[PDB]
UniProtKB/Swiss-Prot annotation, chain A:
The chain holds residues 93 to 433 of 440 of the full protein. Component of the 26S proteasome, a multiprotein complex involved in the ATP-dependent degradation of ubiquitinated proteins. This complex plays a key role in the maintenance of protein homeostasis by removing misfolded or damaged proteins, which could impair cellular functions, and by removing proteins whose functions are no longer required. Therefore, the proteasome participates in numerous cellular processes, including cell cycle progression, apoptosis, or DNA damage repair. GO terms for biological process: proteasome-mediated ubiquitin-dependent protein catabolic process. Keywords: Acetylation, ATP-binding, Cytoplasm, Deafness, Intellectual disability, Isopeptide bond, Lipoprotein, Membrane, Myristate, Nucleotide-binding, Nucleus, Phosphoprotein, Proteasome, Ubl conjugation. It is linked to Birk-Aharoni syndrome: An autosomal recessive disorder characterized by failure to thrive, severe developmental delay, intellectual disability, spastic tetraplegia with central hypotonia, chorea, hearing loss, micropenis and undescended testes, as well as mild elevation of liver enzymes. It is found in: Cytoplasm; Nucleus; Membrane. It comes from Homo sapiens. This is 26S proteasome regulatory subunit 4. The keyword Nucleotidyltransferase does not apply. The keyword Cell inner membrane does not apply.
Curated annotation (Swiss-Prot), chain B:
Component of the 26S proteasome, a multiprotein complex involved in the ATP-dependent degradation of ubiquitinated proteins. This complex plays a key role in the maintenance of protein homeostasis by removing misfolded or damaged proteins, which could impair cellular functions, and by removing proteins whose functions are no longer required. Therefore, the proteasome participates in numerous cellular processes, including cell cycle progression, apoptosis, or DNA damage repair. It comes from Homo sapiens. Disulfide bonds: none annotated. The chain holds residues 141 to 209 of 418 of the full protein. Component of the 19S proteasome regulatory particle complex. The 26S proteasome consists of a 20S core particle (CP) and two 19S regulatory subunits (RP). The regulatory particle is made of a lid composed of 9 subunits, a base containing 6 ATPases including PSMC4 and few additional components. Interacts with NR1I3. Interacts with PAAF1. Interacts with TRIM5. Interacts with ZFAND1. This is 26S proteasome regulatory subunit 6B. It is found in: Cytoplasm; Nucleus. Belongs to the AAA ATPase family. It comes from the Eukaryota.
Curated annotation (Swiss-Prot), chain D:
Monoubiquitinated by RNF181. The keyword ATP-binding applies. The gene is PSMC2. The chain holds residues 73 to 433 of 433 of the full protein. The modification N6-acetyllysine is found at residues 44, 350. ATP binds at residues 144-151. This is 26S proteasome regulatory subunit 7. It comes from Homo sapiens. GO terms for biological process: osteoblast differentiation; positive regulation of proteasomal protein catabolic process; proteasome-mediated ubiquitin-dependent protein catabolic process; ubiquitin-dependent protein catabolic process. One of its GO terms (cellular component) is cytoplasm. Induction: Expression is not cell cycle-dependent and occurs throughout the cell cycle. Component of the 19S proteasome regulatory particle complex. The 26S proteasome consists of a 20S core particle (CP) and two 19S regulatory subunits (RP). The regulatory particle is made of a lid composed of 9 subunits, a base containing 6 ATPases including PSMC2 and few additional components. Interacts with NDC80/HEC; this interaction is detected only during M phase. Interacts and SQSTM1. Interacts with PAAF1. Directly interacts with TRIM5.
From Swiss-Prot, chain E:
This is 26S proteasome regulatory subunit 8. Keywords: Acetylation, ATP-binding, Cytoplasm, Nucleotide-binding, Nucleus, Phosphoprotein, Proteasome. GO terms for biological process: negative regulation of DNA-templated transcription; negative regulation of programmed cell death; positive regulation of DNA-templated transcription; positive regulation of inclusion body assembly; positive regulation of proteasomal protein catabolic process; proteasome-mediated ubiquitin-dependent protein catabolic process; regulation of transcription by RNA polymerase II. The chain holds residues 52 to 394 of 406 of the full protein. The modification Phosphoserine is found at residue 69. It is found in: Cytoplasm; Nucleus. It comes from the Eukaryota. The gene is PSMC5.
C-alpha cells in the first residue's frame, strides 16, 4: 500500500548495481562498486541482511550508495552447462545383456531417492556414487546406462579432461563450482567419464603442469572425499582405462561400487542388432546369424553404424527397406573401415 | 562541425620531406624481393586501372620477414 | 585487456582495411622479427595477402654487398 | 508479508539516520602522520589528502596503514575501521559447526591420545602447562594411508569447544598469476593473530610443499615461494603462533617442509592402519547400524581381512545390508554377507587400491 | 521554420547539462525496472518509461538511455552474431558450387548427410535410421575442404561457424569455461548451424606430442560436443566438419571406435579437375582463347587446387608488367614454371 509508494521514492528512480564487499555489525556494510567505492550503509529494509553474504549483488541508491534491496541474478555459464535436459528417450530397457551388469548401479542410483524404505530402514546408506569402466572405446556405452538415470532425479554431465587443464589454473576452481552448484541444486547427479587428466599429454594453450593437473585431480578427490560435505550430488565416474587412475580416488569414493563392462556375447550381440533394426524395415533375406558370427567384439553403435550406412545406401537406391546384399557390402564399408585403419 | 578533415589528433603524416636517408642503390643483394616489393607497391600505385582491365585484384596487404640480416 | 581492446583495434583497422577497397587507396606494408606469434587472421587471405621473406645473403648477395659497402 | 511490512516501515527512522555518517565513502589508509593534528592519507579513489579526524575519535587511536572512515567533502577521518581484509577466500576457509565425535575413532588410541592432548589439554587447561612450563609444542603432523586421514580432523571439529579453527585445503593456495597465495597465507596468519588462540589445519600439503627444485626453467618457483614463504611466516619469532597448526597428508615427502617442521613443529605420528582386534571396533561402531543376528562373530571377520583400514570394512558393513536388501532379508547373517565381504575385499582388491604404503614407501 | 530554430534552443537546454546516455540492458526486472549496463560506467537498474514497454525490451539490447530519470528513451539495434560471422567472414568466402569442381562425387555424398536432416528428416524414421553427427575431410592439401564447408552451408542457408578461432572468440563468447557450451549456446540460438574445424590440420603439429593434446582437445572439443548432441540436448542440424590429413585420422578414429562419424574422403587434384576448375579461375581475367587448357593443366602433375589460383593470378602478373590488357598462353605457362620452381 503506502510503503510501496514510499520506499520507491528513496530508491528511485535510478539506483546503481553494487557488490557487497564485507559486513560490519553496525548494520553498516562495506560495499564495492566500480570503481574502488567503499561505504557504510545501515538499512533495515528488504533485508534478508543475514542471507546476503559478501560477493553478491546489492542495490545501491545514488544517494548515497544506499541499499534498498538485493537481486540475485544468474544465469552464469556453469548453470547453463547443466541442463537442458534431455529427459532422453533412451531407457535402460533399450539396451540388453547388461541386466546383471546394470541391476546393481540401477539400485545404487534408485536405492536412495526413489524407494527409500529398505534403504533408510536398513541403516546402511551407500550414496557415495559409482565408478564405471570398459573396453575398448565404450563408456558412452555406459551413457546408455546413465541415459536411463537422466530420466529421473536431477542431473549434470561433466566429462573429459579438456574442462580441467584447458588454460592456466585456478586448478580445480571449475571443479569447485561444479561441486558447490550441484550441492545448491541437491539432490542431483554428476556424471564423469573418460578421465584422461593423466592420459592427456599436451597442455592446452600455455599451461602447466603435470603435477598441477595431478594436484587439481587431488583436490577433486578432497572435494569428493570430503571435508566436510554431505551434499548429494551423487558422482558417477567412468573411463576406458582404469590403469592410469590413482588408488587415492577409490578408498574415499567410490569405495563400495564399481562395475566392469564386458563385451557382448552371441545372444547379446543378436539382441542389440534386433534393438537397432526394430525401427528399420529390412528385406526378407536379412540374417543376423552370419553377421554376429563374422563380426568380432562389436558393441551397440558399431552394428548400429552398419545399420546407418545400410540405410544410407538404401537411400542411394531410395528404398525404404534395406537389402541383405547391400547390408553385407554396406557392412563391408565398416568391416573394411576397421580393417583399413 | 567535425574534423575539417583531417586535422588529427596525433602521429602525424610526412616527416618525409626531411627524409629518407639514402637511395636504393645502397643494397644490391635482393633484386628479387625488391621486385615483389616493386610489383606489390608501385605498380599498383601508378595503375589502379590496368588491374581492372586485366581482371586481377591487387591486395594492399604486405608482410616482410626473415631477419636478420 | 586494454591491449585486448587494441587488438580489437587491430580488428577495427582490419575492417577499415577491407574498407579501403575498392580502389583508392592505401598500401599496408609490414615487417616483424618473429612472425610465429602473429595471429593468422591478419595473414589469412583477404587482408594481408603478401608474405615476403628476406633470405640470408648468398654468393650473388655476397659479392653485391661487398662491392656496395666497399 | 507482515515481517516485510514492519521491515519497510523502519525507513522513516532510517532516513533520519541516513543523513549522518553516510559520507563514510570511502575507506582509506593513511601513509604517514605529518604532525600531531595532521595525517597524510591515501584512498582507493587514488587521490591523497592530508587532514585531521572527526574529533569524537581520539587522535591516539590511529596507526600507519589504518583503514579509517571519512567525511568525503572535508576528507577528515570519520572513524577508524579495524578490518583491512579479506578477499572471500579466507572466510571461505573460516570454518564452523562440529560433526563426527570422538567415539567414531576406530580404536586408534596412542595416536588419538597424543594428537588429542597436544590440542585440547593446552587449550582446555592452559594454566596446567603454565604451572609446569616448559611449553607445549607448536604444531603436529598426520599422514599415512587414506584410511583414515582427515576424519580424525572431523573429530577435532566435534570435540572443539570454544575458539573456532580454520580449515585450509591444499589446492586453494596454488593459483595462477603468481603472488596471490602469498598474500593469502600471510593475511590468514594475520587473521589467526586477530582470532586469539584459534587454530589452523592443512590437508593435501604434499601438493604445495613439493621440494626442492629442478634444473630449469621452473617449475617449483611459484610452489617454492609459496611454501618457503609459509615457513618464512613460521620462522618469525612472533607469536608464534599461540594458534598451533595441524598437518595431515598422504606421503611424508617432501623433505624441505619436513626439515623445516621439526624445529617449530613436532609430534609427528603415523598410522596404523588396522590392528588385529582394532578392526572389531570398526565392526562395533558400524555394528550399531542395521541389525545384527546374535550369532555374528566379529573377530573371525576381522582376522580374515587384513590391511582394510576402516573404510573398506565400512563398505563391508555396507554390502551386508546391500545384499540383505537384494535378498529382502531384514537381517544379514555373518555367513550371508561374508560372501559379499570376500567378494568386496577379494574382487575389489584384485584390480587396484591398497598400495598406499607404496605411495609413501 | 521560425519555430524550429526556437526548438533547437529548448532542446539544447535539455541536452546541455547531461544530454542523454546510451544504455545496454543486461536483464529486465519484475517491478518494471530494467537492469542496464553502460560501457564506461557500472550497472544500473531503471524503470518505466511509459512510452517504452517491458515486452519490447529484452536482455542484451542497445537502448538509448535517458539522462534525467536514467531511463530508456529508445530501442536501438545491437550486434551479437556479427563478431561470429565477422571472425568467420574474414576466414572463408561464400564459394557456391560454381567455384568448385571435381568434388561432384563428394558433394553428392555429403548432400545426404547435410541435406537430409535439414529438409527430409521424417524419412530418417521412415527408414528407422539415426541422424549423422558430423563429417570429416581427409586429403593432401590441396584446397576445397574449406570451400565445400561454406558451399554446403551456403546453399543450405544454415548459419556457418568455424571452430576456434583464436583469441577473441573467447572474448565475445563467454568468459572462461569449457566454452563449447557457450559456443553451443550460440549454435542453439541460431539453428540450423554448421560447425567447421578451423583448421588444426598441419605438419606443425606433426610431432605426435604437442599436436597430440593441443589438437586432441579440439578433437575433444568435438568429442564432448558429440556427447552433448548424441547423449542429450536438442535437437538436430547442428553439425561438425573436419579437415585433417593423416595421423589424427588414425588417432581420431582411434578415439572413434567405429563410432561415431561419417567418413568422406578429400581427393588429390586430377588433370580434368585442373582443366575445368582452371577455367573456373581463368574466367575472371581478360585473356585470349589461344591457350590449350589440356597441356597447360597437364603441365601441373600433382600440385594442388590453389595451384590453379597461383598459376592464373601470377600469370596475370607478367600480363600487367607486360602492359598487355589481355594475356596469352605463353604467360600462363611462364606461371606454370613459377609455381613449379618451389617443387
Ligand atoms: N579407523 C577408522 N575409524 C573410523 N572410521 C573410519 C576408519 N577408517 C576409515 N573410516 C571411515 O572411512 C571413511 C574414509 O576415510 P577418509 O576419507 O576420512 O580418509 P581420507 O580422507 O581418504 O584420508 P586422506 O585425507 O589421507 O585422503 C571415513 O568416512 C571414515 O568414517
Ligand atoms: N551393447 C550396447 N547396447 C546398446 N547400445 C549400445 C551398446 N554399446 C554401445 N551402444 C550405444 O553406442 C554408444 C557407445 O558409446 P562409445 O563411443 O562406445 O563410448 P565412449 O564415447 O565413452 O568412448 C552409446 O551411446 C550407446 O547408446
Ligand atoms: N577443387 C579446386 N580446384 C582448384 N582450386 C580450388 C579448388 N578448391 C578450392 N580452390 C581454391 O582454393 C582457395 C581456398 O581453398 P580452401 O578451401 O581454403 O583450402 P584449404 O582448406 O586447404 O585452405 C579458393 O579461393 C579456391 O579458389
Amino acid at each position: 500500500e503506502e510503503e510501496r509508494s514510499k520506499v520507491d521514492d528513496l530508491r528511485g528512480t535510478p539506483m546503481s548495481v553494487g557488490t557487497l564487499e564485507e559486513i560490519i555489525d553496525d548494520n553498516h556494510a562495506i560495499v564495492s562498486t566500480s570503481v574502488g567505492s567503499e561505504h557504510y550503509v545501515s538499512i533495515l529494509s528488504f533485508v534478508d541482511k543475514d542471507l546476503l553474504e559478501p560477493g553478491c549483488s546489492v542495490l545501491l541508491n545514488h544517494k548515497v550508495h544506499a541499499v534498498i534491496g538485493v537481486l540475485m541474478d544468474d544465469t552464469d555459464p556453469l548453470v547453463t552447462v547443466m541442463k537442458v535436459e534431455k529427459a532422453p528417450q533412451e531407457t535402460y530397457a533399450d539396451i540388453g545383456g547388461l541386466d546383471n551388469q546394470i541391476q546393481e548401479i540401477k539400485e545404487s542410483v534408485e536405492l536412495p531417492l526413489t524407494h527409500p524404505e529398505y534403504y533408510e530402514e536398513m541403516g546402511i546408506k551407500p550414496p557415495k556414487g559409482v565408478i564405471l569402466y570398459g573396453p575398448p572405446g565404450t563408456g558412452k556405452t555406459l551413457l546408455a546406462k546413465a541415459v536411463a538415470n537422466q530420466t529421473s532425479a536431477t542431473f549434470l554431465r561433466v566429462v573429459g579432461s579438456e574442462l580441467i587443464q584447458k588454460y592456466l589454473g585456478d586448478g580445480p576452481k571449475l571443479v569447485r563450482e561444479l561441486f558447490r552448484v550441484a550441492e545448491e541444486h541437491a539432490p542431483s547427479i554428476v556424471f564423469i567419464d573418460e578421465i584422461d587428466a593423466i592420459g592427456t599429454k599436451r597442455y592446452d594453450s600455455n599451461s602447466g603442469g603435470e603435477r598441477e593437473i595431478q594436484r587439481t585431480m587431488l583436490e577433486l578427490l578432497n572435494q569428493l572425499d570430503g571435508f566436510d560435505s554431505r551434499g548429494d550430488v551423487k558422482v558417477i565416474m567412468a573411463t576406458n582405462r582404469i590403469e592410469t587412475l590413482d588408488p587415492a580416488l577409490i578408498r574415499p569414493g567410490r569405495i563400495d561400487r564399481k562395475i566392469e563392462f564386458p563385451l557382448p556375447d552371441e545372444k547379446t550381440k543378436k539382441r542389440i542388432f534386433q534393438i537397432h533394426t526394430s525401427r528399420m524395415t529390412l528385406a526378407d533375406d536379412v540374417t543376423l546369424d552370419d553377421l554376429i558370427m563374422a563380426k568380432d567384439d562389436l558393441s551397440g553403435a558399431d552394428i548400429k553404424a552398419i545399420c546407418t550406412e545400410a540405410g544410407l545406401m538404401a537411400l542411394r537406391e531410395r528404398r525404404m527397406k534395406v537389402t541383405n546384399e547391400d547390408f553385407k557390402k554396406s557392412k563391408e564399408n565398416v568391416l573394411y573401415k576397421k580393417q583399413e585403419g | 562541425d567535425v574534423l575539417p578533415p583531417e586535422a588529427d589528433s596525433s602521429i602525424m603524416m610526412l616527416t618525409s620531406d626531411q627524409k629518407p636517408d639514402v637511395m636504393y642503390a645502397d643494397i644490391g643483394g635482393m633484386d628479387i624481393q625488391k621486385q615483389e616489393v616493386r610489383e606489390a607497391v608501385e605498380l599498383p600505385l601508378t595503375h589502379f586501372e590496368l588491374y581492372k582491365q586485366i581482371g586481377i585484384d591487387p591486395p594492399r596487404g604486405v608482410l616482410m620477414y626473415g631477419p636478420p640480416g | 585487456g586494454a591491449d585486448r581492446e587494441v587488438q580489437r583495434i587491430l580488428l577495427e583497422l582490419l575492417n577499415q582495411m577491407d574498407g579501403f577497397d575498392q580502389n583508392v587507396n592505401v598500401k599496408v606494408i609490414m615487417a616483424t622479427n618473429r612472425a610465429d606469434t602473429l595471429d593468422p587472421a591478419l595473414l589469412r587471405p583477404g587482408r594481408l595477402d603478401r608474405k615476403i621473406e628476406f633470405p640470408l645473403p648468398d654468393r650473388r648477395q655476397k659479392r653485391l654487398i661487398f662491392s656496395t659497402i666497399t | 508479508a507482515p515481517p516485510a511490512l514492519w521491515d519497510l516501515a523502519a525507513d522513516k527512522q532510517t532516513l533520519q539516520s541516513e543523513q549522518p555518517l553516510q559520507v563514510a565513502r570511502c575507506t582509506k589508509i593513511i601513509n604517514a602522520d605529518s604532525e600531531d593534528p595532521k595525517y597524510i592519507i591515501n584512498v582507493k579513489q587514488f587521490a591523497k589528502f592530508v587532514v585531521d579526524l572527526s574529533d569524537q575519535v581520539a587522535p591516539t587511536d590511529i596507526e600507519e596503514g589504518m583503514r579509517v572512515g571519512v567525511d568525503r567533502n572535508k576528507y577528515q577521518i570519520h572513524i577508524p575501521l579495524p578490518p583491512k581484509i579479506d578477499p572471500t577466500v579466507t572466510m571461505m576457509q573460516v570454518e564452523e559447526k562440529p560433526d563426527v565425535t570422538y567415539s567414531d575413532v576406530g580404536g586408534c588410541k596412542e595416536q588419538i591420545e597424543k594428537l588429542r592432548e597436544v590440542v585440547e589439554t593446552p587449550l582446555l587447561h592452559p594454566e596446567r602447562f603454565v604451572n609446569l612450563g616448559i611449553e607445549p609444542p607448536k604444531g603436529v603432523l598426520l599422514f599415512g594411508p587414506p584410511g583414515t586421514g582427515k576424519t580424525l580432523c572431523a573429530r577435532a571439529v566435534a570435540n572443539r569447544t570454544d575458539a573456532c579453527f580454520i580449515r585450509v585445503i591444499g589446492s586453494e593456495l596454488v593459483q595462477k598469476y603468481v603472488g596471490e597465495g602469498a598474500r593469502m597465507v600471510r593475511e590468514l596468519f594475520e587473521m589467526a593473530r586477530t582470532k586469539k588462540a584459534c587454530l589452523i589445519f592443512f590437508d593435501e600439503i604434499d601438493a604445495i610443499g613439493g621440494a626442492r627444485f629442478d634444473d630449469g626453467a621452473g617449475g617449483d618457483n611459484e610452489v617454492q615461494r609459496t611454501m618457503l614463504e609459509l615457513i618464512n611466516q613460521l620462522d618469525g619469532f612472533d607469536p608464534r603462533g599461540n594458534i598451533k597448526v595441524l598437518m595431515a597428508t598422504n606421503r611424508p615427502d617432501t623433505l624441505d617442509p619436513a626439515l623445516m617442521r621439526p624445529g617449530r613443529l613436532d609430534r609427528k605420528i603415523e598410522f596404523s592402519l588396522p590392528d588385529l582386534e582394532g578392526r572389531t571396533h570398526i565392526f562395533k561402531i558400524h555394528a550399531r547400524s542395521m541389525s545384527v543376528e546374535r550369532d555374528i562373530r566379529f573377530e573371525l571377520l576381522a582376522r580374515l581381512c587384513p590391511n582394510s583400514t576402516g573404510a573398506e570394512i565400512r563398505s563391508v558393513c555396507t554390502e551386508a545390508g546391500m545384499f540383505a536388501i537384494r535378498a529382502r532379508r531384514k537381517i544379514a547373517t555373518e555367513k550371508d554377507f561374508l560372501e559379499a565381504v570376500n567378494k568386496v575385499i577379494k574382487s575389489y582388491a584384485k584390480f587396484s587400491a591398497t598400495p598406499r604404503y607404496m605411495t609413501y614407501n | 521554420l521560425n519555430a524550429k530554430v526556437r526548438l533547437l534552443r529548448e532542446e539544447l537546454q535539455l541536452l546541455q547539462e547531461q544530454g542523454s546516455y546510451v544504455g545496454e540492458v543486461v536483464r529486465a526486472m519484475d517491478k518494471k525496472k530494467v537492469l542496464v549496463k553502460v560501457h564506461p560506467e557500472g550497472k544500473f537498474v531503471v524503470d518505466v518509461d511509459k512510452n517504452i514497454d517491458i515486452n519490447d525490451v529484452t536482455p542484451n539490447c542497445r537502448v538509448a538511455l535517458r539522462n534525467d530519470s536514467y531511463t530508456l528513451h529508445k530501442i536501438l539495434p545491437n550486434k551479437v552474431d556479427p563478431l561470429v560471422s565477422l571472425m568467420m567472414v574474414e576466414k572463408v568466402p561464400d564459394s557456391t558450387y560454381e567455384m568448385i569442381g571435381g568434388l561432384d562425387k563428394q558433394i553428392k555424398e555429403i548432400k545426404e548427410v547435410i541435406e537430409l536432416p535439414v529438409k527430409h528428416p521424417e524419412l530418417f524414421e521412415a527408414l528407422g535410421i539415426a541422424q549423422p553427427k558430423g563429417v570429416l575431410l581427409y586429403g593432401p592439401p590441396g584446397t576445397g575442404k574449406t570451400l565445400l564447408a561454406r558451399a554446403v552451408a551456403h546453399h543450405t542457408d544454415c548459419t556457418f561457424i568455424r571452430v576456434s578461432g583464436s583469441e577473441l572468440v573467447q572474448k565475445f563468447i563467454g568468459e572462461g569455461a569449457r566454452m563449447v557450451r557457450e559456443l553451443f549456446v550460440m549454435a542453439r540460438e541460431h539453428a540450423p548451424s554448421i560447425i567447421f574445424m578451423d583448421e588444426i590440420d598441419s605438419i606443425g603439429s606433426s610431432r605426435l606430442e604437442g599436436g597430440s593434446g593441443g589438437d586432441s582437445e579440439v578433437q575433444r572439443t568435438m568429442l564432448e560436443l558429440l556427447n552433448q548432441l548424441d547423449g542429450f540436448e536438442a535437437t538436430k542440424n547442428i553439425k561438425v566438419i573436419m579437415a585433417t590429413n593423416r595421423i589424427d585420422i588414425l588417432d581420431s578414429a582411434l578415439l572413434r571406435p567405429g563410432r561415431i562419424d561419417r567418413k568422406i574422403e578429400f581427393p588429390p587434384p586430377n588433370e580434368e579437375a585442373r582443366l575445368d576448375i582452371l577455367k573456373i579461375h581463368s574466367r575472371k581475367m581478360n585473356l585470349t582463347r589461344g591457350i590449350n587448357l589440356r597441356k597447360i593443366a597437364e603441365l601441373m602433375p600433382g600440385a594442388s587446387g590453389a595451384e590453379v589460383k597461383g598459376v592464373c593470378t601470377e600469370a596475370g602478373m607478367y600480363a600487367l608488367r607486360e602492359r598487355r590488357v589481355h594475356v596469352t598462353q605463353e604467360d600462363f605457362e611462364m606461371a606454370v614454371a613459377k609455381v613449379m620452381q618451389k617443387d
